[PDB]
Amino acid sequence: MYLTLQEWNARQRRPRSLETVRRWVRESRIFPPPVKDGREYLFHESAVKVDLNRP
Amino acid sequence: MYLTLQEWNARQRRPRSLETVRRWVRESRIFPPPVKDGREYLFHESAVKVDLNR
Amino acid sequence: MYLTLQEWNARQRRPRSLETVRRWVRESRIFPPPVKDGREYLFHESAVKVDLN
Amino acid sequence: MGRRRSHERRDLPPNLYIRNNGYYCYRDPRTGKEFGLGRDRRIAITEAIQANIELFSGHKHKPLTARINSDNSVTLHSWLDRYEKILASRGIKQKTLINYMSKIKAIRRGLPDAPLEDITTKEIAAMLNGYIDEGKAASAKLIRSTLSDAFREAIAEGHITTNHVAATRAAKSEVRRSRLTADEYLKIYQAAESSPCWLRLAMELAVVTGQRVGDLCEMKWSDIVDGYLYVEQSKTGVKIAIPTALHIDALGISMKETLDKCKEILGGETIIASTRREPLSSGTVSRYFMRARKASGLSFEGDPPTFHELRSLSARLYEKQISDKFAQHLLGHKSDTMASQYRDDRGREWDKIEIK
Amino acid sequence: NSVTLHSWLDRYEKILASRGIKQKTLINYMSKIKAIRRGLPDAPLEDITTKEIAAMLNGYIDEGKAASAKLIRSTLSDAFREAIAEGHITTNHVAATRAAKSEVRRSRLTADEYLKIYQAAESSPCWLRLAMELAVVTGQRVGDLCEMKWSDIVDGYLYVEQSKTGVKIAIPTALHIDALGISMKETLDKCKEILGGETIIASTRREPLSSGTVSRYFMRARKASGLSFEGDPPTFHELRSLSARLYEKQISDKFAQHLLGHKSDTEWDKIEIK
Amino acid sequence: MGRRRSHERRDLPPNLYIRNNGYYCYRDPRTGKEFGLGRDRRIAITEAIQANIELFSGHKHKPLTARINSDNSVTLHSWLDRYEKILASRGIKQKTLINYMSKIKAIRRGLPDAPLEDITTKEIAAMLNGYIDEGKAASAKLIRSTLSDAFREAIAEGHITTNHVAATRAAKSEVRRSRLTADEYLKIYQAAESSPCWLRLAMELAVVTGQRVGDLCEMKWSDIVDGYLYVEQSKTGVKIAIPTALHIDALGISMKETLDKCKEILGGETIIASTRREPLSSGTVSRYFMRARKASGLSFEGDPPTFHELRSLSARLYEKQISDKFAQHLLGHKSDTEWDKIEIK
């Protein structure tokens, strides 16, 4: 089962903007990264945003 | 079940200023840490304060 | 859920000075006893001034 | 002490300190020594804080709406360790004991380290229901039962006086293991050509004898005398003798004909051996049976059947073939409760009624 | 704090709403909870004594409603058992009581009685008679008899999906009761000519009917016939009981069980020579 | 007292205990000792004031809640003494009484001598398990059952109120005594050559009649009418009459031939006598049967079979020779209470 860009963001702790979610995908802030299918992205069921930074 | 910084401060013994709430997170005075998700912390349903001293 | 020192004494019949009320706290003259938040005390809405002896 | 507080521990938990090298080390309240863990600040403190799940060290606890009743006692995580020392003396088979340990291990990573008269019924329900929301309902039932008998033996040793676990209910499973028809049987046997030869022989032998996959890999060519098949089940312990004259017309499989095939092609000490002329495990037989299932392409509703389902299909066939009492003694089963709960369909085939 | 009985009964209903059960089933329990409301004061659970619980229970037993007391006692007990799970109280003062044993007083139906009711159903519409013969020839429950569509019949069969249990069976259109003079086939075709609708049993307006009106009008023809019984007059559901009782002596017992929709087994036996 | 009043006590929480290094330690009014409470001033006092006042209820017309006041009782040993007296009047076999007193002596050397209202469930379990780890599993089951019965009768009188023994669990053990075969009996029968003559006759007569060794020693020749064998079982009291016509075709031993061999060789009032032509005890017939076991040179898995196994062997032979209803109608069995050939049926 693979959720879409909107469906995935509609299940997070706090729904954000479509363009915002698109930014994480480009910043690899989505583990695991979505898969390209057609024109939209397909995220994983247990997909959750992470922070690739160690201050 | 995870809540926001605003929703969490609403369910405490005494609601304080948002500034003070952010301070506790930075000073690591809550088990477990909120963990920044984007640009807004996400408290855990069991994340309570601890308070230190010297 | 709780009430501040002023919000509790203001509801009393004979609102005494802040100091005097703070003294009934250290002398456990208030039961149920109040808890210390940060700099102020937040009593219970049912907390009464139990005058004994 | 020499150093009560400092400007270094001021940002560190009670355990764990910081050396003159910017490194951190966590003390040990069992010897007074410590190990170096971490180079960063928010890492050593965020590491020496979950062991710190047990500051009892000050703080007490209280939820929303509750009562009070306590005094003093000891830990409990240790009781789970003493409970295992009692189960090993109850005289249990070497397979059931492992089933208990796995559950006790789940209780370890489920409930917080806590005394025994502290873990309220509400805390046990939060962990129990957590497995239900995941779908694993059959697990919550065993975890509850095990965690229930643990406290029972605890009360009998002067530690607890009540059994909070008996307050909460147990999940009710529905068994979503789809059955296997006679038509889907040939569909799998036909796709079992890519798989070894012992698979098809043991697949038919498991439907002609209606035995367990475990005892199916325990039969030797010495257990056959005067045309009988002496089989000793290990699960229950029942002993039966299967005649080598059986036959299933619904699938066209003869008992004797199937036996001989395992004597020429296979060959060995056991009825069902491997290509290396050696006995296989009970987990490898049903393993390859899966491959032919997925390779088939057929679809079901719920959870795909299994090699053990062959035992069920064997019973349903023998029913209409000969009689009902026949598909009861062969399965090494007695009583009168499962004989009916093994003939059902469970939402698959309509129970058609005929003029008879 | 936050205690009290009523306050809990409100947080208890939501719990049963997530149990995942039938609609009508959830309603049955609610009616029992409301009875407890006006049956016991509004005070903490730890204050409720076993005496007050039995005082209300027995009050419904003397009124004649002993059956209701059993469910109310079995439901009120579940509430407390779930209350302890939350940590509200420590004991269930309901497990100390005793449920009143009630005996079924709903008389059965015979062959002679049925014939007297069918003829008395003349004043009634033209679908009741069809519903009677059908409920006795199929031996099905009134609940599913109303949800039967002509699309269910497939090549001489009658696919019926029981709502209560959920059993799936297929009654062939070849059955016939040899005691009243009714034929499955002749009965079905009689419904296609007279009624004429999407469902086997419809109204005069060619539209499906509720299961509460099928047994309702049957009652009118019951009291209109002028037949006396012992206890409580049989109902439309009794046609199901009469159906099996007839098929057991018409064909076989293993047939009646398969017709009703049963799976497991659960008067004047004969002492054979051997 | 020595201190009465002083500083560091002017904090006010009773049972206080502020030591030199600023460390509170609540005292217990049961031993006098105390445990380290806390290192704060307004924290330890709170954990000491809540103890003084015993709360439970919440707003009511004068509650109750009891948790004190108690006296008048008896001691374990003392009560265990009269307990034996009550058992002697219960009306039972003398042998049964001995097996109960044997468990009583075990309790004496297993539990202290303090008021019966002080024995905790823990103490009882500590003694019970002490016999479980020693391999004496079956023993900790009889002692536990007897101990629990001594408390219930104690409550009946009015001594105590609760049976703390009804909280523990009784261990479940598995039989260890092995089963005798038909090939091992022949071997032992040959190893019994070094033993007296009555041993051989006792063995055969214990497998052909399937009677208890205790009753086998009480068999008189007067209990043989025409072609029967009246034997009044002493265990339960079941009356039976074994006909002099049976014979084991698995060992080649006829009951008639066996009886006659006991009339010439032995010679006495009892079918099974000694060389002195006099009745022998039941503990002597089995003791010498053992001498043949270790002499035969046959090892078993666990505990070596006894003379009683001859009975079990007698039943397992007749069960295949004639019928099953026959075996149950020989050993003295009343009601019902290794491979079943599953034919095409």
What does this structure look like?
This is part of a larger assembly, with 3 copies of chain A and 3 copies of chain D. Chain A has one domain: Multidrug-efflux Transporter Regulator, Chain: A, Domain 2. A two-stranded antiparallel ribbon of chain A has the order 1-4. Chain A has helices at residues 5-9, 18-26; strands spanning 30-31, 35-37, 40-42, 48-49. The radius of gyration of chain A is 11 Å and the shape is globular. In chain A, 25% of the residues lie in helices and 18% in strands. In chain D, 35% of the residues lie in helices and 8% in strands. Chain D has helices at 41-44, 79-87, 96-108, 121-132, 137-155, 183-190, 197-208, 213-216, 255-266, 282-296, 309-321, 326-329; strands at 17-18, 24-27, 34-36, 224-225, 228-232, 239-243, 247-248, 253-254, 351-352. Chain D is elongated, with a radius of gyration of 29 Å. Chains in contact: A-B, B-C, B-D, D-E, D-F. Chain D binds chain F through residues 58, 68, 72, 89-91, 152-153, 155-159, 228, 230, 239-243, 245, 322-323, 325-326, 329-330, and chain F through 35, 38, 43, 55, 120-123, 125, 132-133, 167-169, 172-174, 338-345.
Task: Summarize the SSE layout with pairings.
This is part of a larger assembly, with three copies of chain A and three copies of chain D.
Chain A: H1 5-9, H2 18-26, E1 30-31, E2 35-37, E3 40-42, E4 48-49
Antiparallel strand pairs in A: 1-4, 2-3
Chain D: E1 17-18, E2 24-27, E3 34-36, H1 41-44, H2 79-87, H3 96-108, H4 121-132, H5 137-155, H6 183-190, H7 197-208, H8 213-216, E4 224-225, E5 228-232, E6 239-243, E7 247-248, E8 253-254, H9 255-266, H10 282-296, H11 309-321, H12 326-329, E9 351-352
Antiparallel strand pairs in D: 1-2, 2-3, 4-5, 5-6, 7-8
Helix pairs in contact in D: 3-5, 4-5, 7-9, 7-11
Organism (chain B): Escherichia phage lambda (Bacteriophage lambda)
Protein name (chain B): Excisionase
Subunit structure (chain B): Interacts (via C-terminus) with the integrase (via N-terminus). Part of the excision complex made of the integrase tetramer, IHF, Fis and Xis.
